[PDB]
Amino acid sequence: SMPRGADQENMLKISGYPGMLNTFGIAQLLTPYRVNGITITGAQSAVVALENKFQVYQAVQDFNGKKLDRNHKLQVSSLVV
Amino acid sequence: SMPRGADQENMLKISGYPGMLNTFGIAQLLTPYRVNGITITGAQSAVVALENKFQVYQAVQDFNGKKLDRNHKLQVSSLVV
Ligand SMILES: [Cl-]
């Protein structure tokens, strides 16, 4: 799942993807960002460890509000805020 | 990690990617195929569990020989011959 000794500044919160995705599929959703761990927190929500805070900020810009289909829209935010 | 009850007929062998990829990055290589598990077998090799034999066959067609950069090209095959 998640590396035990991670820093919260590298973490991304992501929700709204289709519940069918497993943890590998969540990493696939975020290609090409390096993903170091994923914790599933809900039916359609997870926390994802990226490389550093610059990756987190760019991932937020790239994916937040993105429409996946008619019934799914991504909510993406930095864990540390 | 790799589920214990997985069948080798649903599995592919993948090698030649940059050794700096982790298990999540190997799944990202294979987007959008559903990945159910991954076992690292070497510095630049792994075994990946897909959904069924059709996915294994199409993943081989799609990814075998793919050039990632000047020094890296993928070798992809069915685990069982
Ligand atoms: Cl996907």
Ligand SMILES: [Cl-]
């Ligand atoms: Cl949720």
